[PDB]
Amino acid sequence: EKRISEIEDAAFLAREKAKADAEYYAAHKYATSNKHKLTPEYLELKKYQAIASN
């Protein structure tokens, strides 16, 4: 069972690295998309919607 746990650690470490890189790439494309979408008018619209939501 200790050997099995070592194998599980080897597998889990790689899986978490893949999830880290997938989130890193998504954030970078979100970040570079914000520079166009996040304008004063879009922020004003979001402000209105959030303030008046409930």
Binding site: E1, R3, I7, E8, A10, A11, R15
Partner: protein, 49 residues
């Protein structure tokens, strides 16, 4: 009669003990094979992961 029934009962108990030891060895070997299989299973699971 009791002095001989004593030896008879002793021999029967010894037979039971030997059978139990044989069964224990059987279970030990079966477990060894099963856990080798489990290790191989987890290696393949790592590949799948």
């Amino acid at each position: 009669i009791a002095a001989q029934k004593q030896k008879v009962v002793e021999k029967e108990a010894e037979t039971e003990r030997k059978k139990a030891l044989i069964e224990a060895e059987k279970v030990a070997q079966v477990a060894e094979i099963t856990y080798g299989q489990k290790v191989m299973e987890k290696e393949t699971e790592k590949k799948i992961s």
